Amino acid sequence: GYFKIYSKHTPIIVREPEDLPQGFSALEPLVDLPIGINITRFQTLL
Amino acid sequence: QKLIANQFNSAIGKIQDSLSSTASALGKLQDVVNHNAQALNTLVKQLS
């Protein structure tokens, strides 16, 4: 059914496109919306 | 007499050294508590 979203904001320091850092971070849910939508693809928006 | 007494004292003083070290000397007493805790943990974990 519904569409769940998990996220966490964290300030880091890294080479700016490269080497996604180490460590651990738990992603907390923010908003759940009760839709009945079938999703097969998704398109990012820059 | 003094040699036997000194050997007995040196063997008794090494018992506390051999018991406080190696971290697994009292395994036969720890395993009973581990089994009695594992059974009580399994009895609650099968209620779900």
């Binding site: 907390e28 849910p29 923010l30 | 974990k45 209620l47 779900s48």
Partner: protein, 48 residues
């Protein structure tokens, strides 16, 4: 508070003493189960 009372929190039943929490709950969750499916803390629906 501080009394054995029957409750009904959003469908689930149970019997217990509904005292204070003294907890550190994150605001996205409701239940507070410790080991098994027993309910330690359940959030209020009006006062939250």
């Amino acid at each position: 508070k501080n009394k054995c009372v029957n409750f009904n929190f959003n469908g689930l039943k149970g019997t217990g003493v509904l005292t204070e929490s003294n907890k550190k709950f994150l605001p996205f969750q409701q239940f507070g189960r410790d080991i098994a499916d027993t309910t330690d803390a359940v959030r209020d629906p009006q006062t939250l």
